[PDB]
Design a protein around this ligand. Structure first.
Ligand SMILES: CCCCCCCCCCCCCCCCCC(=O)OC[C@H](CO[C@@H]1O[C@H](CO[C@H]2O[C@H](CO)[C@H](O)[C@H](O)[C@H]2O)[C@H](O)[C@H](O)[C@H]1O)OC(=O)CCCCCCCCCCCCCCCCC
Ligand code: CLA
Ligand code: CLA
Ligand code: CLA
Ligand code: CLA
Ligand code: CLA
Ligand code: CLA
Ligand SMILES: CC(/C=C/C=C(C)/C=C/[C@@]12O[C@]1(C)C[C@@H](O)CC2(C)C)=C\C=C\C=C(C)\C=C\C=C(C)\C=C\[C@@]12O[C@]1(C)C[C@@H](O)CC2(C)C
Ligand SMILES: CC1=C[C@@H](O)CC(C)(C)[C@@H]1/C=C/C(C)=C/C=C/C(C)=C/C=C/C=C(C)/C=C/C=C(C)/C=C\C1=C(C)C[C@@H](O)CC1(C)C
Ligand SMILES: CC1=C(/C=C/C(C)=C/C=C/C(C)=C/C=C/C=C(C)/C=C/C=C(C)/C=C/C2=C(C)CCCC2(C)C)C(C)(C)CCC1
Ligand SMILES: CC1=C(/C=C/C(C)=C\C=C/C(C)=C/C=C/C=C(C)/C=C/C=C(C)/C=C/C2=C(C)CCCC2(C)C)C(C)(C)CCC1
Lengths: 226, 209, 210, 83
């Protein structure tokens, strides 16, 4: 089924994308948008799909990293001092900073920005020039950076070492499920930020509040309404 | 032809059943590369062997403590050990690391190149310290040879890998029991056999809040 | 179409008839939908039977009334950790032969075994019985249709050797009563949620006061 | 805001009246054009199961109009001392 597919949007997109539910009211996948040669603008279908899948993976990792500490700290899996809210770890020092860490948060930020700058710059250079990171010697792991025709799905001996989806149907199902779970986690992280701003508590605490009292703890009661 | 991890499952192409305990339970498609296959086989063998050594030690200490010997529980036994041992902390860890580096580097370089340790480099020993198989050495490590005949050698390989798998399942059971009930494993078994219908994993353990 | 049982054409939401009709994966093929519907219906049959048995058997006095309590209280469906409807969590007033989580672990092990056998038969029929299963592999014969395996274990009475017309009539009666079980269990659980009493109590209230 | 309050009742009534007007002639919508009367237009957006010309932008526009009419009525009645 097409989930709310706007008409006159199917005129330029067929079913090749993983999700592709036909939802494009404003219109950004049109090849008439940013047509020409060279770099062009940022609104092109290749970059749109790439940023969509990267946002999906990052939001999925973020939702996992927002649920796992609070959930495991509600039980005895994670101790109470390390079971802080996701925004009270130190990502926002007004919200809260975990002082009992092995390093200063800015030192961790510098290590993180160096590592993720290496990763994302290699990713960008492979996006501009496919297979380019497999040529220049990096550490001996150049064969792991072979990539593929689609920059969203590089594969190789490391990114897909389970080599799942030998057939095309399994590839299509896996891509559709990945983009679906990523969109679900994008909406999830949206709700997590909204609840963190409004309620000032973890998402599992808000879920437990809604479970205990549906009408007494909901969006209407969150902002003072009845 | 052989029993697998699931009835009707297809064994992997890189798992032909020539290894010990080759039930085909490889759903992450690891050990597809032959060098990776040797690495995974050696890693599983070493992890299993240390698991059953530790499990035998823990079970012996626990049954001796239940019998009446002045032995503590397997948890936090290192604290009373370092309180009683003349060797201080840090020093003996470094000595056992010095002893473990040597044999493990020999094992790693025999895994990379079989027969590399049979050149007489270590005290002129050539027949000993030679790997008969990839993860299975021979010579000095086996004092008496029940591995000379091939059928009982294969049977012993299968028995070794299965008992090792059971023992590392027993080790994760050990850590789960001592994080849930905080009692000795022999005491836990005694509690289970005393009242099986009531002394379960949830009534006494922390597994359920 | 009329080959599938209950092909009345009642599909207003159009959740069926997907383009990718692969039986393996995608969780949306018509054979998979029919299989899931019939096993959900059979589980609804069992749920309705188990939610009607203890109350009316305690009312009739066949079983003692101390154990003939309502289904949600005897099933662990209580507040517990404010989860409303989670089995094997709420405290049951009557002490049983073992702990709740004991047969919850037997739940996990045994039903995982049975469901993996069913999934392996669905993926590749005729291959599950090849492996040794302590002599229990021959108890479940393979079949072309995964929804209707047949054999000695699944058909003990042998009322499946007649012609295909009577078998199809039995199949459509079974799935029609399965949809009736769907409606009955939905009403069961929503009345138990909004009244916090057994279905027999509010059934007697409705009989006395229509 | 409060469930059962007069403001809630009359603004729910206003939103429902706007939706009913958009569904059947009356208020101009996506499929309704021209200044004096309302004439049929192109479907523009697929309605996704809704009969006639009732798409997502239709319900968005008329929900916005209903909320605006409701808040205007509420504040006008509060200004004159009524409900
Ligand atoms: C900007 C984008 C969103 C950034 C925040 C993401 C969510 C989050 O981590 O949200 C959490 C943070 C922290 O805010 C509050 O922080 C509190 C912690 O403060 C504590 O410590 C404080 C110290 O000064 C005070 O003493 C305070 O009283 C005390 O409670 C609690 O954790 C609350 O649950 C929490 O909501 O929110 C904030 O930074 C709120 C920032 C609001 C900026 C505007 C957001 C968008 C508004 C709609 C327009 C579109
Ligand atoms: C919900 C409000 C809303 C609506 C209905 C529109 C609708 C439109 N905008 Mg606008 N836009 C909005 C908010 C909105 N925009 C905001 C907040 C910004 C600032 C970031 C812009 C910046 C913007 C630019 C720079 C351009 C448009 C353009 C367009 C047209 C097609 C592209 C499109 O769908 O937007 C896609 C763009 C977005 C920013 C998505 C907004 C989606 C909202 C937030 C929901 C369409 C008439 C294009 C146009 O008319 O070209 C002739 C154009 O060039 N918009
Ligand atoms: C006067 C303001 C103005 C206007 C009308 C536009 C209009 C446009 N720009 Mg530009 N842009 C602007 C300011 C503006 N930009 C500024 C200040 C910057 C620097 C930060 C850029 C950087 C920029 C890039 C790098 C790209 C565009 C692109 C576009 C097009 C996409 C329109 C769209 O979908 O909405 C905008 C869409 C959004 C999702 C809005 C995002 C807004 C958040 C805050 C970021 C459109 C022709 C793209 C293009 O040419 O593709 C056709 C493109 O690749 N613009
Ligand atoms: C860490 C120990 C370890 C290692 C190195 C191996 C390695 C190997 N085993 Mg083995 N296996 C293990 C544990 C391990 N296994 C356990 C615990 C079981 C019982 C469930 C089995 C059962 C088993 C069978 C039945 C078969 C193998 C086979 C294989 C080979 C296939 C490659 C493979 O499994 O992926 C490599 C494996 C890993 C990299 C291990 C990943 C461990 C992750 C990181 C731990 C994550 C948490 C985990 C879930 C534990 C949490 C607690 C849990 C107990 C509940 C390879 C030689 C097959 C073979 O060809 O035999 C030689 C075969 O037929 N194994
Ligand atoms: C001091 C001597 C010494 C040396 C050279 C090694 C070196 C090695 N051992 Mg190790 N080992 C040591 C001490 C030593 N260890 C000690 C003190 C123990 C505790 C008893 C172990 C227990 C151990 C196990 C159980 C295993 C290894 C494995 C390995 C290899 C993994 C290499 C790796 O990923 O980096 C090291 C990375 C981290 C430590 C993290 C490597 C060859 C693994 C192996 O050979 O798999 C193929 C393996 O399964 N060793
Ligand atoms: C198989 C059909 C069936 C039958 C015989 C009953 C029988 C009953 N229902 Mg239930 N009901 C059912 C299915 C059914 N239910 C389903 C599927 C739903 C979900 C849509 C409901 C939702 C429902 C509500 C919301 C309420 C009842 C109530 C009742 C009781 C009084 C009768 C009544 O108010 O009208 C039946 C009403 C229907 C909507 C049907 C009675 C025990 C009432 C109750 O428990 O109070 C004593 C009550 O308030 N029913
Ligand atoms: C039930 C119908 C109703 C009534 C009685 C009122 C009455 C009023 N409104 Mg209101 N209004 C209504 C519907 C109504 N409005 C609707 C449907 C809208 C949306 C279009 C508005 C939008 C509106 C605005 C934007 C303003 C008023 C204002 C006013 C005041 C203008 C008269 C005045 O003070 O002397 C002259 C008065 C309190 C004005 C005000 O605040 O005065 C107090 C003002 O600024 N109204
Ligand atoms: C659980 C475990 C490994 C589990 C691995 C799993 C499930 C892997 C599964 C899979 O890969 C497969 C198979 C196939 C893939 O398709 C799927 C996945 C999922 C990828 C190892 C334990 C391994 C356990 C080991 C090695 C235990 C060693 C114990 C020692 C050394 C004891 C020493 C002691 O010090 C103590 C601790 C305390 C003192 O009181 C006593 C003494 C004796 C001093
Ligand atoms: C009304 C009301 C009222 C209110 O008050 C409340 C409520 C709750 C709502 C209610 C409702 C209810 C309902 C709905 C119910 C239903 C039921 C069912 C359906 C059942 C089935 C049921 C069913 C049934 C019996 C069936 C049966 C069948 C059979 C046996 C067959 C076959 C077989 C088998 C398989 C087994 C083997 O060994 C044998 C044989 C023979 C081979
Ligand atoms: C999930 C999770 C997480 C996360 C994680 C992450 C996010 C990670 C990342 C990571 C990363 C991101 C990493 C990276 C790394 C990198 C590196 C390590 C690099 C290196 C490099 C080099 C070494 C180079 C060199 C060279 C060459 C090659 C030549 C010459 C020159 C030069 C020097 C440049 C955490 C833990 C938090 C928690 C838990 C869970
Ligand atoms: C019949 C039907 C149905 C139903 C539906 C419904 C019930 C709907 C609703 C809807 C709605 C109910 C919507 C709404 C919307 C709303 C809106 C969109 C509004 C507003 C917004 C805003 C943003 C606002 C603003 C403002 C302010 C703040 C100030 C000034 C004034 C105003 C008010 C403008 C169903 C599907 C079941 C089935 C089929 C058919």
């Amino acid at each position: 089924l097409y989930v709310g597919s706007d008409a006159a949007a199917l005129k330029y997109l067929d079913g090749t994308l993983p999700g592709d539910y036909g939802f494009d009211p404003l219109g950004l996948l049109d090849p008439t948008v940013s047509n020409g040669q060279g770099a062009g603008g940022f609104v092109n279908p290749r970059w749109l799909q790439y940023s969509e899948v990267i946002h999906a993976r990052w939001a999925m990792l973020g939702a996992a990293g927002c649920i796992a500490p609070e959930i495991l700290g509600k039980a005895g899996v994670i101790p109470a001092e390390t079971a802080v809210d996701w925004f009270r770890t130190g990502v926002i020092p007004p919200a809260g900073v975990y002082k009992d860490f092995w390093a200063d948060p800015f030192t961790l930020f510098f290590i993180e920005v160096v590592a993720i700058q290496f990763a994302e710059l290699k990713r960008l250079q492979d996006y501009k020039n496919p297979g380019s990171q497999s040529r220049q010697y990096f550490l001996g792991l150049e064969g792991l950076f072979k990539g593929s025709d689609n920059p969203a799905y590089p594969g190789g001996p490391f990114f897909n070492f389970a080599n799942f989806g030998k057939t095309e149907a399994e590839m299509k199902k896996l891509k559709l499920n990945e983009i679906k779970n990523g969109r679900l986690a994008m909406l999830a992280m949206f709700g997590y930020g909204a609840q963190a701003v409004i309620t000032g508590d973890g998402p599992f605490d808000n879920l437990l509040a809604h479970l205990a009292d549906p009408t007494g703890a909901n969006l209407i009661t969150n902002l003072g309404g009845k | 032809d052989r029993p697998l991890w699931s009835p009707g499952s297809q064994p992997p192409a890189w798992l032909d059943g020539s290894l010990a305990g080759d039930y085909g339970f490889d759903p992450l498609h690891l050990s597809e590369e032959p060098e990776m296959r040797k690495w995974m086989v050696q890693a599983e063998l070493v992890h299993a062997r240390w698991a059953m050594l530790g499990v035998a030690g823990i079970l012996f200490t626990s049954i001796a403590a239940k019998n009446g010997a002045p032995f503590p529980d397997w948890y936090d036994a290192g604290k009373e050990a370092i309180k009683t041992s003349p060797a201080p902390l840090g020093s003996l860890i470094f000595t056992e690391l010095l002893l473990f580096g040597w044999v493990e580097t020999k094992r790693l370089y025999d895994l990379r190149n079989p027969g590399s340790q049979g050149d007489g480099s270590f005290l002129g020993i050539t027949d000993g310290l030679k790997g008969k198989e990839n993860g299975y050495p021979g010579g000095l490590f086996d004092p008496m040879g029940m591995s000379k005949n091939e059928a009982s050698f294969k049977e012993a390989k299968v028995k070794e890998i299965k008992n090792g798998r059971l023992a590392m399942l027993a080790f994760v059971g050990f850590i789960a029991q001592h994080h849930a009930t905080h009692k000795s494993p022999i005491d836990n078994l005694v509690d289970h056999v005393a009242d099986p219908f009531h002394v379960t994993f949830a009534t006494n353990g922390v597994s359920v809040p | 179409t009329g080959s599938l049982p209950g092909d009345f054409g009642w599909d207003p939401l159009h959740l069926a008839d997907t383009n990718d009709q692969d039986r393996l994966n995608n969780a949306m093929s018509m054979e998979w939908l029919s299989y899931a519907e019939v096993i959900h219906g059979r589980w609804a049959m069992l749920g309705a039977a188990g939610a009607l048995s203890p109350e009316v058997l305690g009312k009739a006095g066949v079983i003692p009334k101390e154990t003939g309590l309502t289904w949600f209280q005897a099933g662990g469906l209580d507040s517990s950790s404010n989860l409303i409807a989670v089995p094997f969590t709420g405290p049951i007033p009557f002490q049983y032969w073992t702990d709740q989580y004991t047969l919850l672990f037997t739940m996990l092990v045994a039903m995982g075994f049975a469901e993996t056998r069913r999934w392996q038969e669905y993926k590749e029929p005729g291959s599950v019985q090849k492996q040794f299963f302590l002599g229990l592999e021959k108890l479940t014969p393979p079949s072309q249709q995964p929804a209707y395996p047949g054999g000695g274990f699944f058909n003990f009475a042998g009322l499946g050797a007649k012609d295909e017309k009577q078998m199809f009539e039995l199949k459509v009666k079974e799935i029609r009563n399965g949809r009736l079980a769907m409606l009955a269990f939905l009403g069961f659980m929503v009345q138990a949620e909004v009244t916090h009493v057994g279905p027999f109590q509010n059934l007697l209230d409705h009989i006395n006061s229509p | 805001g409060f469930i059962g309050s007069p403001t809630n009742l009359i603004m729910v009534a206003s939103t429902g009246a706007c939706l009913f007007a958009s569904r059947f002639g009356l208020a101009p919508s996506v499929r309704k054009v021209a200044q004096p009367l309302k004439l049929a237009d192109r479907e523009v957006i697929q309605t996704t199961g809704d009969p006639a010309g009732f798409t997502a932008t239709d319900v968005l526009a008329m929900g916005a109009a209903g909320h605006a009419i409701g808040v205007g009525i509420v504040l006008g009645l509060k200004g004159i001392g009524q409900l």
